[PDB]
């Protein structure tokens with residue numbers, strides 16, 4: 001079977017189609033700096049693991065940790 | 080073309096693993112993170128980590144540790 | 159904010175939906191099972207090359223691939 | 239568990255600083271060019287794990303190399 005990647009790309013594209021734009025703006029209204037990015041991260045994770053901890057939420061949090069770091073580096077300094 | 084880079088990373092990565100991996104296995108072992116309070120230990124570790132500054136290597140090391148700590152719990156999460 | 163904030167609640171609850179959606183995707187769960195831990199890495203690199211074969215790139219694909227990769231790791235870590 | 243927690247913290251500072259202070263790594267990152275980067279990552283990951291070995295040290299190195307590669311293109 002070779003469609004696994006093609007199906008992952010489809011699955012991944014559906015996620016990007018309806019969340020990415022939403023995430024781009026929320027992060028912008030967060031205005032994260034290098035000083036308070038982690039505090040926001042801790043508060044986000046706490047409310048995320050509030051209703052339970054499954055692997056997908058763990059994965060989404062770790063992925064969000066990296067995207068938030070990339071956002072800080074790019075749009076930091078209170079942009 | 081790009082071969083000397085892959086094997087230089089593997090060299091670098093093995094040196095890191097040789098002298099830290101044994102260290103980490105026991106600390107996580109002593110820590111006994113539960114399927115429950117793992118995020119608390121993670122929050123305290125990250126705070127203690129970003130006190131002396133935030134460089135990309137500390138960001139990378141933290142996200143990696145978050146993933147290893149999650150993999151640790153799902154295996155040893157009994158308590 | 160500074161420690162609290164509205165948007166933290168919007169981002170967290172948005173992270174709930176993506177994570178629960180990944181664990182609730184039955185085609186994704188079947189794809190994990192369909193794989194074999196005879197050569198694990200090679201399965202991942204053939205899937206990653208097939209995934210980015212169309213030349214497209216986005217964050218949704220990052221999460222999908224990362225979830226698949228880690229679930230693949232969990233399987234091998236507790237299944238052979 | 240705060241005894242080990244701050245020892246875990248100090249190990250992550252030391253690992254993070256060693257990567258940012260690794261000149262062989264820093265030079266290798268610069269040697270790459272953003273004419274085609276993700277490909278670089280997929281070929282480097284395959285050459286790295288060609289010897290079949292797998293561990294946490296190689297993952298962190300590869301993740302640092304990959305992410306520094308992303309930062310470069312972003313700036």
Ligand SMILES: CCCCCCCCOCCOCCOCCOCCOCCO
Nearest residue numbers: 062063066142143146147150151231293294
């Ligand atoms: C783009 C999101 C970045 C998140 C960073 C996570 C790092 C990515 O690595 C995922 C690949 O997993 C590697 C699994 O390595 C297993 C090592 O074997 C040791 C066996 O013992 C496991 C102890 O935890």
